[PDB]
Amino acid sequence: KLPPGPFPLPIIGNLFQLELKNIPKSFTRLAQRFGPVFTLYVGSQRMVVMHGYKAVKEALLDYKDEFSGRGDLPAFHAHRDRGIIFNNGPTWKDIRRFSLTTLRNYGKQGNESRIQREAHFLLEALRKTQGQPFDPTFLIGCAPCNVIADILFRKHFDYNDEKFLRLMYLFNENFHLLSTPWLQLYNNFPSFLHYLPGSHRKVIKNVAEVKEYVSERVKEHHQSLDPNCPRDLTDCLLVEMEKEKHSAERLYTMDGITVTVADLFFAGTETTSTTLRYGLLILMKYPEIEEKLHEEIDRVIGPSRIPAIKDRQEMPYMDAVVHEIQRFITLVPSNLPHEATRDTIFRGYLIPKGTVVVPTLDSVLYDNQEFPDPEKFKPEHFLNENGKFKYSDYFKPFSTGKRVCAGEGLARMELFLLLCAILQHFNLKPLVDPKDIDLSPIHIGFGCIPPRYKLCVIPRS
Ligand code: HEM
Ligand SMILES: O=C(O)CCCCCCCCCn1ccnc1
């Protein structure tokens, strides 16, 4: 006995129910017609979609083990059932718990200091543009890139090095491309379409170039490994592997490790970068907000002292903007796809093993009761009428549960420390009138991709 759904047609199924440029808006339409749990078939891959905090909460927390699987994402058949993001096999639980442990120890003062170092290079690069117009995409991006780099490869990159930029280029191209209608079709009809021309070929060339670059980095680390002396997360995984040779039941291969690593790298980068990039664009739209932030920075931190995590509890306005940048932009709006590990019962309904379960996040992030006027950027969505920070259980842009984002703590510290560093030293100057900025995502699918723009940064000191 399944959840309500539209009458699915042969082979295509429910395709017609969805606008491919805007799946999330199409899920919300379905939420009115059929309620907070509904059944879609696309391909003949059956999926269950939950809408609204109540229904999204339950699915993620109440039925933890049941929905802890990873729905199939064919663009990433080079990552599939290895690593962490894209993996549905029995190899998942142990790689995830171990990578989590490792991050937390590299992370505690290590993350604050690491991020803090990186901001010196970031600011230098922003100064360097000598107040003239620049696309921030591959400037602001280098900062979260380096941070995940040093954790992963103890490697640090200059801002103009060829390969660095090429990695960032691929990260960005795949994200744009994975948010286009053409890719959405690819994702549910992979065997009809895979071998045809079109930009799934590009997204796949690119997944491979990234895996190849990482591959080489993991072999480099083999060949000069001091087992006594990890230098980065790569070594720790190599080390977990060597402790595991005398065992026919293998839970790490060179392959296993290169994927864990690629996952962390591209997620460690593209994710923070998009957020930051969409944050600056928002703040050029609302000059009054950017200015309230300058006053609070100058009052609590002053012209020059480096920003720290301890400054957060003391800046309730920044805290609400960093929260609202994330809330408003709904970076991953349909979440990452879950799947039923087991046949299960949800509220009243049957969900078979192998059903893709979509616990949609923008429906939570955009609750009309939690956040009146959810369509508007409004810092006071996280402030009592009293100027103090207002916590929300509805702030789930990292999801929650057995598969909660592995990079949460890092990302959150990044958006804060970095936004702070940026605005302390510069003001934003756009090249169009604040009134004229479209803040709407240009591509909506896998992520929400912001308009491409240029700006100027004007030194404060
Ligand atoms: C900056 C904003 C970020 C957002 C909004 C975000 C969001 C998400 C979301 C929504 C998921 C899906 C959770 C689920 O399966 O239910 C996810 C998974 C994941 N994220 Fe992130 N992320 C961000 C940054 C990062 C960073 C910085 C890293 C790593 C350094 C990271 C690493 C991962 C990994 C490895 C998974 C797969 C988890 C698993 O299946 O066990 N993310 N992320
Ligand atoms: O294809 C590659 O190897 C690199 C490009 C992949 C870009 C995907 C970025 C999506 C952000 C969603 N996410 C992924 C993990 N945590 C959040």
Curated annotation (Swiss-Prot):
Compartments reported by the entry: Endoplasmic reticulum membrane; Microsome membrane; Mitochondrion inner membrane
Residue numbers binding heme: C405
Modes of activity regulation: The omega-1 hydroxylase activity is stimulated by cytochrome b5.
InterPro entries according to UniProt: Cyt_P450, Cyt_P450_CS, Cyt_P450_E_grp-I, Cyt_P450_E_grp-I_CYP2E-like, Cyt_P450_sf, Cytochrome_P450_fam2
Keyword Iron: yes
SUPFAM superfamilies documented for this protein: Cytochrome P450
Substrates-to-products reaction catalysed: an organic molecule + reduced [NADPH--hemoprotein reductase] + O2 = an alcohol + oxidized [NADPH--hemoprotein reductase] + H2O + H(+); (5Z,8Z,11Z)-eicosatrienoate + reduced [NADPH--hemoprotein reductase] + O2 = 19-hydroxy-(5Z,8Z,11Z)-eicosatrienoate + oxidized [NADPH--hemoprotein reductase] + H2O + H(+); (5Z,8Z,11Z,14Z,17Z)-eicosapentaenoate + reduced [NADPH--hemoprotein reductase] + O2 = 19-hydroxy-(5Z,8Z,11Z,14Z,17Z)-eicosapentaenoate + oxidized [NADPH--hemoprotein reductase] + H2O + H(+); (4Z,7Z,10Z,13Z,16Z,19Z)-docosahexaenoate + reduced [NADPH--hemoprotein reductase] + O2 = 21-hydroxy-(4Z,7Z,10Z,13Z,16Z,19Z)-docosahexaenoate + oxidized [NADPH--hemoprotein reductase] + H2O + H(+)
UniProt-listed Pfam families: p450
Pathway membership, UniProt: Lipid metabolism; fatty acid metabolism
Membrane topology: Peripheral membrane protein
GO biological process: 4-nitrophenol metabolic process; benzene metabolic process; carbon tetrachloride metabolic process; epoxygenase P450 pathway; halogenated hydrocarbon metabolic process; lipid hydroxylation; long-chain fatty acid biosynthetic process; long-chain fatty acid metabolic process
Gene Ontology terms, MF aspect: 4-nitrophenol 2-monooxygenase activity; arachidonate epoxygenase activity; enzyme binding; heme binding; Hsp70 protein binding; Hsp90 protein binding; iron ion binding; long-chain fatty acid omega-1 hydroxylase activity
EC assignment: 1.14.14.1, 1.14.13.n7
Role according to the record: A cytochrome P450 monooxygenase involved in the metabolism of fatty acids. Mechanistically, uses molecular oxygen inserting one oxygen atom into a substrate, and reducing the second into a water molecule, with two electrons provided by NADPH via cytochrome P450 reductase (NADPH--hemoprotein reductase). Catalyzes the hydroxylation of carbon-hydrogen bonds. Hydroxylates fatty acids specifically at the omega-1 position displaying the highest catalytic activity for saturated fatty acids. May be involved in the oxidative metabolism of xenobiotics.
PANTHER family, sorted: CYTOCHROME P450 2E1, CYTOCHROME P450 508A4-RELATED
Family to which this protein belongs: Belongs to the cytochrome P450 family.
Quaternary structure (record): Interacts with chaperones HSP70 and HSP90; this interaction is required for initial targeting to mitochondria.
Name of the protein: Cytochrome P450 2E1
